[PDB]
Amino acid sequence: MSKSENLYAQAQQLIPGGVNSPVRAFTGVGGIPLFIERADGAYLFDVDGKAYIDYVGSWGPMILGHNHPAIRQAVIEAVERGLSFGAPTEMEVKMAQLVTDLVPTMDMVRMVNSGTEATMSAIRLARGYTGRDKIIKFEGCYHGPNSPGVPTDFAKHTLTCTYNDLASVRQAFEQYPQEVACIIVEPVAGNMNCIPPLPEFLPGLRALCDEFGALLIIDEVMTGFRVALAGAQDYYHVIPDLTCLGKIIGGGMPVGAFGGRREVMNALAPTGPVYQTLSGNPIAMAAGFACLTEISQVGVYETLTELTDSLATGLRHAAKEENIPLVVNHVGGMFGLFFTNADTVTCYQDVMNCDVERFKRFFHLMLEEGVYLAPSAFEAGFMSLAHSNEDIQKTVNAARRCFAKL
Amino acid sequence: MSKSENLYAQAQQLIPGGVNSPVRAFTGVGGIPLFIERADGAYLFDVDGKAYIDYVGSWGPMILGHNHPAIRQAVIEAVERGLSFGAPTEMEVKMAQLVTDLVPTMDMVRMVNSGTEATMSAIRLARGYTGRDKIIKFEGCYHGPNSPGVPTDFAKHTLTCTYNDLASVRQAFEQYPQEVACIIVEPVAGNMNCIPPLPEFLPGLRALCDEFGALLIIDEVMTGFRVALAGAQDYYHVIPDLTCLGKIIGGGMPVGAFGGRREVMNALAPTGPVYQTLSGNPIAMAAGFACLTEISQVGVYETLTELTDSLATGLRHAAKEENIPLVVNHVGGMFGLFFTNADTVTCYQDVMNCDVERFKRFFHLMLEEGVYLAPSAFEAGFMSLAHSNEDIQKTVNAARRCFAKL
Ligand code: NA
Ligand code: NA
Incomplete structure (x- = not known):
């Protein structure tokens, strides 16, 4: 043994x-x-x-x-100042500036405690911004038969489509023309193993969202900073309404972020009516800041x-x-x-x-x-x-x- | 300026x-x-x-x-070994042993990334274990008019009762005798400011759960290790089916945990059918371990x-x-x-x-x-x-x- x-x-x-x-x-x-x-x-x-x-x-x-070493050094230095404060810090501002610099599609951003909080917050924002209830997600794609512990009516407003199949997405939209708040998609599937998109797929999702008034949410918690510096959205040349980030942005400690078009993000409270969760930990944001500085070289x-x-x-x-x-x-x-x-x-x-x-x-x-x-x-x-x-x-x-x- | x-x-x-x-x-x-x-x-x-x-x-x-200093020292030492591994560690075992030693009502425990994940996981476990859908929560109590971004049917299985009012709780149970999976309660309310329980209140919730076959979940994310070493449940002499922990257990970095009776916890996968979220970060668990060692003196x-x-x-x-x-x-x-x-x-x-x-x-x-x-x-x-x-x-x-x- x-x-x-x-x-x-x-x-x-x-x-x-x-x-x-x-x-x-x-x-x-x-x-x-x-x-x-x-x-x-x-x-x-x-x-x-x-x-x-x-x-x-x-x-x-x-x-x-x-x-x-650069990440380890940034965290040992930050730890001397205390682990958390429950109040805003300069690192929140510096990190928001660096993330919006690296991922240009994000005009505004909010840091959260995990990738799961970012996707949930982006989904809530899309529902609040559009005033619609339904969401489109893909099978085999996790963002954070029937399993015990969750009531049956929990998945009532979720439409599951087939990854890399634009026809199934059009069918869901044609069933609910004015009811889909958003499509949430992993630009490269990672939770059913690695499945890159077909060349037609991500531009086809952008065109369907535009046609039916839905927001396109690109979940880059795993692909962000891994597929490319500016994300898999940059690599596949697609511009979303909102992006979700996690993982690498924390440099090894849990961190999440969601961001997008200025007018969509302005709908969040106190500026707007949509309310969201825990903020980014300072040690985790120091780790992420150092990580993002290194990989942008x-x-x-x-x-x-x-x-x-x-x-x-x-x-x-x-x-x-x-x-x-x-x-x-x-x-x-x-x-x-x-x-x-x-x-x-x-x-x-x-x-x-x-x-x-x-x-x-x-x-x-x-x-x-x-x-x-x-x-x-x-x-x-x-x-x-x-x-x-x-x-x-x-x-x-x-x-x-x-x-x-x- | x-x-x-x-x-x-x-x-x-x-x-x-x-x-x-x-x-x-x-x-x-x-x-x-x-x-x-x-x-x-x-x-x-x-x-x-x-x-x-x-x-x-x-x-x-x-x-x-x-x-x-004890927390700062434990985290600087742990950081040298790497921030996260995506695989189990000895600290997970040591931390589970220390938490179950300090809070005796917990036979088994699971560490999660935050207090919110712990309460959500405890609620999912109660629903899965009992096979019932409804939950009782108290007004002014947050665990993690109508707000935009969430569909109306989301709060369909939640029964809101009045904190420190046993009559409103009995009324909810009498309306749904075989449908309440659990009561989730902050043993000292902290999210409507500080509201200690009336002497009758927490024992009265234990007696109602026993009468109607519901589980009593005590949310000690804030009260845990703050009201007393063994929690506010020890201070007010009430034994729950499940306890949720957070905050202090992370020593300043986000950590969550949920635990309770051995037979309830055994219903979690792979041992049982209920599936849950992210595990506890090693740096955060090193911080929490040092914190818990110090306050148990x-x-x-x-x-x-x-x-x-x-x-x-x-x-x-x-x-x-x-x-x-x-x-x-x-x-x-x-x-x-x-x-x-x-x-x-x-x-x-x-x-x-x-x-x-x-x-x-x-x-x-x-x-x-x-x-x-x-x-x-x-x-x-x-x-x-x-x-x-x-x-x-x-x-x-x-x-x-x-x-x-x-
Ligand atoms: Na190549
Ligand atoms: Na006293």
């Missing part, structure tokens, strides 16, 4: 399932979860001292890798994309050599692995058709090789700027050995 | 109303909000360098005062209560000398000021009958005296263990001078 196994047994007595986050229970992959002592650059170190090349990046915040996204592209190329080549059907999706610093015979993976149905038991065996074989992947078939992979060409070639060599055993 | 006034003008261009949290806009009191540079012990220091005796305590987290609550009682006594005496009708409510390290002719303040209607314009003038006069009070008539005051007898006598002397000017 390892230190992780002992901590898991201990945890099970006081925490249901031994974990606070059900995905961290390894339910997706099976077995006992890995407890982590520390992290540095491209690596995770478990409680038994084993090192792993990390492709989880704490679920997307660690763009610069773990424990980046020349050549950062070029390097991130080159690292991710080299991993995707190597994995495809390794799978082919070992006769393992595999699709790799990737954009900027984001990627997704799919064990399927399909030529492309562009929708939720394609993800559902992947070989989940094969992914589970691959995941455990990769842990043995010292590679830590997201422990789910329905989660995207993340590249960091601390990963070296050597880390990538080691990962590709490890995947080839794992593919030979499937 | 001060540095706070300049930051506020700057903030208004990019942030609706110049603040992230509408209460921090000083809407309750009027005027331009104070921007805070730093905090230490019992004091806040604004961006112009002015010192204030603080009674906001960052909205309750700062039980040990601001920037406590002998004599802490005795000192906290003595400080709060001496402030309440001094304020009452000062108001009487100056012919200003005032009610002071207080329990453990929590207090509330009420400008009213009423003999007692025990309900929402009493709070509504207070002189709000008098509170607004008092608040601004106290800021001039170097005392920072919650900038709302509907918010409780907080005592810290860093406040000295001299701080308290200075506050009482300042309040007497302010009462003479009302």
Whole structure:
């Protein structure tokens, strides 16, 4: 019995399932979860001292890798001034200025405590601004059969459409022409694994919102600062009414933000009638400020994309050599692995058709090789700027050995 | 124009109303909000360098005062290991053990990212465990006419009762005998200012839940570790089915937790069918662990209560000398000021009958005296263990001078 196994047994007595986050229970992959002592650059170190090349990046915040010195220095300096104040600070203003500089579509912005609060606040704003009740969301897309604990009437004003399918979106609008307040969309799906949009998809959503008087909300909690500096909306050339941000903007600590067109944001109280939640923590905003300053430097996204592209190329080549059907999706610093015979993976149905038991065996074989992947078939992979060409070639060599055993 | 006034003008261009949290806009009191540079012990220091005796305590987290060395040391040490991991840690287990040791009614516990997530998760668990849809909540009580942005059917399964009125609770149960999943109650109301329960009230809620098969959820996000070490539930001798915690458990950074009876908590996934949100951040849990270790030492609550009682006594005496009708409510390290002719303040209607314009003038006069009070008539005051007898006598002397000017 390892230190992780002992901590898991201990945890099970006081925490249901031994974990606070059900995905961290390894339910997706099976077995006992890995407890982590520390992290540095491209690596995770478990409680038994084993090192792993990390492709989880704490679920997307660690763009610069773990424990980046500029972020660590900014937080140690901020901590001397106190953790929180319950009153506004100069960092709130500086952070709002930096975020609106980096993401130009945002004229105004509000910082919140998490990505979930940002999406919920953006949805509430769209409903208040338009005076309409219905929202369009996509299947396999999480923003923050029937599950126990929630009353049936809770999902009454939510219209679920098919990701990358403009016809299903038009159909929902044609059913409710004057009732859709907004479309909320992940510009690159990340919660059904990594699914980039079809070229027609995001401009098609912008044109439908314009036609039917709805607001377009682009949820960049995961894609923000990962796909591109100015977001996946910049990369795919689409201008939304509102943007949601999280993760990277906190530099490793929870932070959220939502922003958009000046006249939409002006509808928020005290300026307007829409009321929203907790403000951004000062330590988390100091971490995020330092992170955003570092990634806005020349050549950062070029390097991130080159690292991710080299991993995707190597994995495809390794799978082919070992006769393992595999699709790799990737954009900027984001990627997704799919064990399927399909030529492309562009929708939720394609993800559902992947070989989940094969992914589970691959995941455990990769842990043995010292590679830590997201422990789910329905989660995207993340590249960091601390990963070296050597880390990538080691990962590709490890995947080839794992593919030979499937 | 001060540095706070300049930051506020700057903030208004990019942030609706110049603040992230509408209460921090000083809407309750009027005027331009104070921007805070730093905090230490019992004091806040604004961006112009002015010192204030603080009674906001960052909205309750700062039980040990601001920037406590044990908390600062624990976070600087934890930050070296990385900010977040997206995987379980030993601190999750240690923190769960410490919280269940301090609050004995909790057999099992789950850590979440905020107090709001804890109350929402506890409400979802009660609904899932009982299979019922309705919840009872109290007016003036916030857990996380009609406001724009939320559809009308959203509050369909919520029954609002009157705080400190057992008859209104019985009436709601008699209307829906087999449909109430739970009662969620702040054991000391803090979001309509400070309203302690009547002696009959919390035991009466326990007896009604038992009669009608509902779960009793005690929301201790604010009262936890403030009223007493084992919570206001220990102080008022009531045993709930579930407890919600926040604030102090994060040592100044956002953290939430919900816990309760072993068989109720076992209904959570993967062990049971109820699914919930983000896990506790490691830096925030290191801050909370150090905070909870410090306040569980002998004599802490005795000192906290003595400080709060001496402030309440001094304020009452000062108001009487100056012919200003005032009610002071207080329990453990929590207090509330009420400008009213009423003999007692025990309900929402009493709070509504207070002189709000008098509170607004008092608040601004106290800021001039170097005392920072919650900038709302509907918010409780907080005592810290860093406040000295001299701080308290200075506050009482300042309040007497302010009462003479009302
Ligand atoms: Na490329
Ligand atoms: Na007393």
